[PDB]
Each structure stands twice: as C-alpha cells, then as structure tokens.
Design an enzyme around this catalytic site. Structure first.
Site, PDB file in Angstrom:
ATOM      1  N   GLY A  13      49.935  39.085  36.396  1.00 36.51           N
ATOM      2  CA  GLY A  13      49.463  39.548  35.710  1.00 36.51           C
ATOM      3  C   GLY A  13      50.429  40.541  34.514  1.00 36.51           C
ATOM      4  O   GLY A  13      50.145  42.238  35.849  1.00 36.51           O
ATOM      5  N   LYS A  14      50.646  41.092  33.206  1.00 32.97           N
ATOM      6  CA  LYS A  14      50.499  42.346  32.900  1.00 32.97           C
ATOM      7  C   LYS A  14      49.852  42.155  32.002  1.00 32.97           C
ATOM      8  O   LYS A  14      50.120  40.708  30.636  1.00 32.97           O
ATOM      9  CB  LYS A  14      52.334  42.313  32.338  1.00 32.97           C
ATOM     10  CG  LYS A  14      52.986  43.609  33.229  1.00 32.97           C
ATOM     11  CD  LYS A  14      53.653  43.616  32.880  1.00 32.97           C
ATOM     12  CE  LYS A  14      54.307  44.969  32.232  1.00 32.97           C
ATOM     13  NZ  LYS A  14      55.519  45.203  31.726  1.00 32.97           N
ATOM     14  N   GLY A  15      49.276  42.895  31.060  1.00 36.28           N
ATOM     15  CA  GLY A  15      48.346  43.231  29.280  1.00 36.28           C
ATOM     16  C   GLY A  15      48.008  44.583  29.227  1.00 36.28           C
ATOM     17  O   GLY A  15      48.384  45.140  29.943  1.00 36.28           O
ATOM     18  N   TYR A  17      45.379  45.990  29.481  1.00 30.33           N
ATOM     19  CA  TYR A  17      44.673  46.516  31.171  1.00 30.33           C
ATOM     20  C   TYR A  17      45.793  46.939  31.890  1.00 30.33           C
ATOM     21  O   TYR A  17      45.101  47.847  33.209  1.00 30.33           O
ATOM     22  CB  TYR A  17      44.297  45.199  31.827  1.00 30.33           C
ATOM     23  CG  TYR A  17      45.203  43.667  31.768  1.00 30.33           C
ATOM     24  CD1 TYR A  17      45.251  43.976  33.414  1.00 30.33           C
ATOM     25  CD2 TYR A  17      44.799  43.186  31.238  1.00 30.33           C
ATOM     26  CE1 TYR A  17      46.010  43.157  34.109  1.00 30.33           C
ATOM     27  CE2 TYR A  17      45.699  41.818  32.044  1.00 30.33           C
ATOM     28  CZ  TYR A  17      46.553  41.779  32.905  1.00 30.33           C
ATOM     29  OH  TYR A  17      47.265  41.303  33.863  1.00 30.33           O
ATOM     30  N   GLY A  18      46.984  46.910  31.756  1.00 30.30           N
ATOM     31  CA  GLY A  18      47.927  47.188  33.113  1.00 30.30           C
ATOM     32  C   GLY A  18      48.499  46.045  34.018  1.00 30.30           C
ATOM     33  O   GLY A  18      48.983  45.216  32.967  1.00 30.30           O
ATOM     34  N   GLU A  19      48.748  46.085  35.045  1.00 30.39           N
ATOM     35  CA  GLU A  19      49.314  44.318  35.580  1.00 30.39           C
ATOM     36  C   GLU A  19      48.425  44.482  36.958  1.00 30.39           C
ATOM     37  O   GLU A  19      47.425  45.908  37.599  1.00 30.39           O
ATOM     38  CB  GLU A  19      50.499  45.718  36.393  1.00 30.39           C
ATOM     39  CG  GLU A  19      51.787  45.308  34.996  1.00 30.39           C
ATOM     40  CD  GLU A  19      53.031  45.948  35.832  1.00 30.39           C
ATOM     41  OE1 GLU A  19      52.512  46.063  37.063  1.00 30.39           O
ATOM     42  OE2 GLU A  19      53.514  46.282  34.745  1.00 30.39           O
ATOM     43  N   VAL A  20      48.311  43.318  37.491  1.00 32.58           N
ATOM     44  CA  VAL A  20      47.528  43.194  38.752  1.00 32.58           C
ATOM     45  C   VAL A  20      48.946  42.188  39.671  1.00 32.58           C
ATOM     46  O   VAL A  20      49.445  41.785  38.731  1.00 32.58           O
ATOM     47  CB  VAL A  20      46.652  41.588  38.603  1.00 32.58           C
ATOM     48  CG1 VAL A  20      46.242  40.864  39.368  1.00 32.58           C
ATOM     49  CG2 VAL A  20      45.521  42.655  37.340  1.00 32.58           C
ATOM     50  N   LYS A  33      45.133  46.469  41.069  1.00 33.31           N
ATOM     51  CA  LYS A  33      45.359  46.057  39.527  1.00 33.31           C
ATOM     52  C   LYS A  33      46.055  48.008  39.089  1.00 33.31           C
ATOM     53  O   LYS A  33      45.963  48.725  40.051  1.00 33.31           O
ATOM     54  CB  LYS A  33      44.373  46.808  38.815  1.00 33.31           C
ATOM     55  CG  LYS A  33      44.302  46.873  37.391  1.00 33.31           C
ATOM     56  CD  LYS A  33      42.046  46.164  37.075  1.00 33.31           C
ATOM     57  CE  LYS A  33      42.588  47.015  35.818  1.00 33.31           C
ATOM     58  NZ  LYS A  33      40.967  46.628  34.924  1.00 33.31           N
ATOM     59  N   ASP A 132      32.050  44.469  30.114  1.00 34.76           N
ATOM     60  CA  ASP A 132      32.531  44.377  28.759  1.00 34.76           C
ATOM     61  C   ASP A 132      33.289  42.990  29.960  1.00 34.76           C
ATOM     62  O   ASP A 132      34.257  42.160  30.170  1.00 34.76           O
ATOM     63  CB  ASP A 132      34.240  44.742  29.533  1.00 34.76           C
ATOM     64  CG  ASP A 132      35.487  44.260  28.479  1.00 34.76           C
ATOM     65  OD1 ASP A 132      35.284  44.199  27.776  1.00 34.76           O
ATOM     66  OD2 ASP A 132      36.465  45.667  28.379  1.00 34.76           O
TER      67      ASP A 132
HETATM   68  C1  LIG Z   1      43.567  40.152  34.355  1.00 33.46           C
HETATM   69  C2  LIG Z   1      42.090  40.005  34.866  1.00 33.46           C
HETATM   70  N1  LIG Z   1      41.856  40.467  36.823  1.00 33.46           N
HETATM   71  C3  LIG Z   1      41.984  39.684  37.386  1.00 33.46           C
HETATM   72  C4  LIG Z   1      42.293  40.460  38.484  1.00 33.46           C
HETATM   73  C5  LIG Z   1      41.939  39.522  40.437  1.00 33.46           C
HETATM   74  C6  LIG Z   1      41.466  39.921  41.602  1.00 33.46           C
HETATM   75  C7  LIG Z   1      41.649  39.729  42.428  1.00 33.46           C
HETATM   76  N2  LIG Z   1      42.749  38.271  42.858  1.00 33.46           N
HETATM   77  C8  LIG Z   1      43.216  38.008  41.313  1.00 33.46           C
HETATM   78  N3  LIG Z   1      44.254  36.609  41.782  1.00 33.46           N
HETATM   79  C9  LIG Z   1      44.942  35.578  40.330  1.00 33.46           C
HETATM   80  C10 LIG Z   1      45.490  34.721  41.417  1.00 33.46           C
HETATM   81  C11 LIG Z   1      46.043  33.777  40.180  1.00 33.46           C
HETATM   82  C12 LIG Z   1      46.011  34.474  39.009  1.00 33.46           C
HETATM   83  N4  LIG Z   1      46.687  33.422  38.466  1.00 33.46           N
HETATM   84  C13 LIG Z   1      46.703  32.686  37.623  1.00 33.46           C
HETATM   85  C14 LIG Z   1      47.775  31.500  36.431  1.00 33.46           C
HETATM   86  N5  LIG Z   1      48.072  31.837  36.179  1.00 33.46           N
HETATM   87  C15 LIG Z   1      48.375  30.903  34.830  1.00 33.46           C
HETATM   88  C16 LIG Z   1      49.728  31.535  33.662  1.00 33.46           C
HETATM   89  O1  LIG Z   1      49.323  31.042  32.899  1.00 33.46           O
HETATM   90  C17 LIG Z   1      48.454  31.357  33.385  1.00 33.46           C
HETATM   91  C18 LIG Z   1      47.934  33.110  35.877  1.00 33.46           C
HETATM   92  C19 LIG Z   1      47.573  34.134  36.927  1.00 33.46           C
HETATM   93  C20 LIG Z   1      45.662  35.211  38.202  1.00 33.46           C
HETATM   94  C21 LIG Z   1      44.591  36.346  39.624  1.00 33.46           C
HETATM   95  N6  LIG Z   1      42.671  39.115  40.070  1.00 33.46           N
HETATM   96  C22 LIG Z   1      42.168  41.662  38.252  1.00 33.46           C
HETATM   97  C23 LIG Z   1      41.850  42.307  39.276  1.00 33.46           C
HETATM   98  C24 LIG Z   1      42.427  43.106  40.598  1.00 33.46           C
HETATM   99  C25 LIG Z   1      42.246  44.269  41.255  1.00 33.46           C
HETATM  100  C26 LIG Z   1      41.582  45.418  40.700  1.00 33.46           C
HETATM  101  N7  LIG Z   1      40.516  44.547  39.502  1.00 33.46           N
HETATM  102  C27 LIG Z   1      40.762  43.863  39.107  1.00 33.46           C
HETATM  103  N8  LIG Z   1      41.571  41.983  37.022  1.00 33.46           N
END
Ligand SMILES: CCn1cc(-c2ccnc(Nc3ccc(N4CCN(C5COC5)CC4)cc3)n2)c(-c2cccnc2)n1
EC number: 2.7.11.30
Length: 295
Positions: A13-15, A17-20, A33, A132
């Site tokens: 993910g990128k937005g 908020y930065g990057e995950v 993150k 938030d």
């Molecule tokens: C941007 C929101 N945020 C998600 C996480 C977060 C934390 C822990 N685990 C995960 N795992 C994850 C697995 C899969 C996907 N995907 C799902 C489907 N995919 C589809 C393409 O269109 C949608 C998009 C991406 C996203 C995240 N994320 C965090 C974060 C991280 C570290 C510290 N503080 C916050 N912030």
C-alpha cells in the site's frame, strides 16, 4: 538492528499516510509502515504511545518496534507491527459479503478494541482516544475479528494527575469521518470526553459500512463509504461541514432494517452514535455490552 534486521518483501500500500510493506523479521511476517516525510509527528506520537504504555490487546494492531533508518540517502521513520494478510476492513468489505455471525464478530471486535483504548487501567495504561477511526484504519485478522491501527492522532488522559495529553500534531482526522463538532470547530478541546465522543461518531459510520454488507432476506448492498451520495471522493472540509453541520445529514438507514432482528440492533446503535449533541452518544463500553448480547 531493529530495522536493518528486516527485509521489505512487498509493498502492499501507498498513500498519503506513506507506505505499508510486508516484510520478514527472523523469517517472520511483519507489517512495516514507512511514514511520509510530512508526517513525522504521527510516527513520533505512535512511537511515544506504544513505548511508554503497555498497549496490548487482541483488537489493537500489535506493536513490535519503531525505528529510524537510512534509505536512498534520506531518513525514514518505521513502525513495525504484526502482519495481517487479509488487509483493511475497507478492502475486505468489497471482497466479500457477511452473514450475521461474521458481521457481529467484526463490529464487536472493533467495539472491544475501542473500549480498551478508552478505558484507563491502573497499576496499566491511560485512557486513549483514537481520533482517526475509519474502515481503512482497521485490519481484519484470520480469525474474523478486527484490530484497530494508526494511533498517530491519539490523545491520552490519566486520572492520577487529571492531565490531558493532546500532543503536538498538526494532522487532523479523515474528513469523511469527522464528527460535526470537529467540523464546526466547537468541540471542547480541554475535555478528554470530547475525543472519546469523536471516536464514537466515527464508529457509527464504520458500523453503518459493515451492516450494509450483511445479507438479509437474500439481499445486500454494494459497499459504499459514509455519505457516498452527497460528497465527492476526497471530500473537502467545507464539503463535510455543509452535509454534517448545516444539513445535519446521516447515512441512510433503510426502514426494512427494522424488520430484521440483527439489523435492528445495529441500526439502533448507529443512530445513538450520531446524535449531533456529543454528550447524547453512547460510550464504547455500552456499545460493547449491547453487541455482546446480540444474536
Ligand atoms: C494503510 C492502512 N494500514 C494497514 C496496515 C497493516 C498493518 C498490518 N498488516 C497489514 N497487512 C495488509 C495485508 C494486505 C493488504 N492488501 C489487501 C487487498 N489489496 C486490494 C488492492 O486493492 C485493495 C490491498 C492491500 C493490506 C495490508 N496492514 C497499516 C500499518 C502497518 C504498520 C504500522 N502501522 C500501521 N496501515
């Protein structure tokens, strides 16, 4: 160490908020993150929280570490947490519909995580308002429960000193989910309760998003975000205030819902999260108890 011990495997993910990133630590899946350069105070606040408080709970994104590191000849701020492969509740609600058990599991886990934030524990954690809360800030776990993430706007209160700690962050909340008193700038900033009430308003919006995706009478709605029908994507500050404060709109609750046992309890809950008078709103603990009782 701590971040040099981590291999960034894929960026999920990128937005703004930065990057995950999914990454390995000891051959283990972790979320990483990477904060946008504009947003160091959120990184600092979250590092401050998870470091100075014993903040651990089933339904709160599990903290592993925070670190600073160089990449491309620049400082990056990292927050490393448990990894949840299913991703955000926001994306989950488009990838699937819900039966009654899985809808209730979801909203109750969220209420439980939020109650744990809101409730001071003595000898221990302070009271914490999130500020938030949104479907994009909520991770779905394998077991079907959720956990709350993104504590960078958090505010804390302790009864021992009666000190409100609002931190120093110019960041404001996601505009779509801002309660009216935030939009019309009347929120009483000195009272910790005001911030809990902002989380409840936002929780009602999430509850609405979820309920919509529950099949009842064989039918279901497409996913839509709160106020999808009255504001554009990336709604502006005045966009939200006109809808929420002037028109005083709420996400629509189909009348049919009051013939379905489950949707009836949910719709009653959300309406009592949306009172325009912040003091009229339920508390997180009351929401948790109510959902705990539903079938
Ligand atoms: C941007 C929101 N945020 C998600 C996480 C977060 C934390 C822990 N685990 C995960 N795992 C994850 C697995 C899969 C996907 N995907 C799902 C489907 N995919 C589809 C393409 O269109 C949608 C998009 C991406 C996203 C995240 N994320 C965090 C974060 C991280 C570290 C510290 N503080 C916050 N912030």
């Amino acid at each position: 160490t701590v971040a040099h011990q981590i291999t960034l495997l894929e960026c999920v993910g990128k937005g703004r908020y930065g990057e995950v990133w999914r990454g390995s630590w000891q051959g283990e899946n972790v979320a990483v993150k990477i904060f946008s350069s504009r947003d160091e105070k959120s990184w600092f606040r979250e590092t401050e929280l998870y470091n100075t408080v014993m903040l651990r709970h089933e339904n709160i994104l599990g903290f592993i570490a925070s670190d600073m590191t160089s990449r491309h000849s620049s400082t990056q701020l990292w927050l490393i947490t448990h990894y949840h492969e299913m991703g955000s509740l926001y994306d989950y609600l488009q990838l699937t519909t819900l039966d009654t058990v899985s809808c209730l599991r979801i909203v109750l886990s969220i209420a439980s995580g939020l109650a744990h934030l809101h409730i001071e524990i003595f000898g221990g954690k302070p009271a914490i308002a999130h500020r938030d809360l949104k479907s994009k800030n909520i991770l779905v776990k394998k077991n079907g429960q959720c956990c709350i993430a993104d504590l960078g706007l958090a505010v804390m209160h302790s009864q021992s000193t009666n000190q409100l700690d609002v931190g120093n962050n110019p960041r404001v909340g996601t505009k779509r989910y801002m309660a009216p008193e935030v939009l019309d700038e009347t929120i009483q900033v000195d009272c910790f309760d005001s911030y809990k009430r902002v989380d409840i308003w936002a929780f009602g919006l999430v509850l609405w998003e979820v309920a919509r995706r529950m099949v009842s009478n064989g039918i279901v709605e497409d996913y839509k975000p709160p106020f999808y029908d009255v504001v554009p994507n990336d709604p502006s500050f005045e966009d939200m205030r006109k809808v929420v404060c002037v028109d005083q709109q709420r996400p629509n609750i189909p009348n049919r819902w009051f013939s379905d046992p489950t949707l009836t309890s949910l719709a009653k809950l959300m309406k009592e999260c949306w009172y325009q008078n912040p003091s009229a709103r339920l508390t997180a603990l009351r929401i948790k108890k109510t959902l705990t009782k539903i079938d």
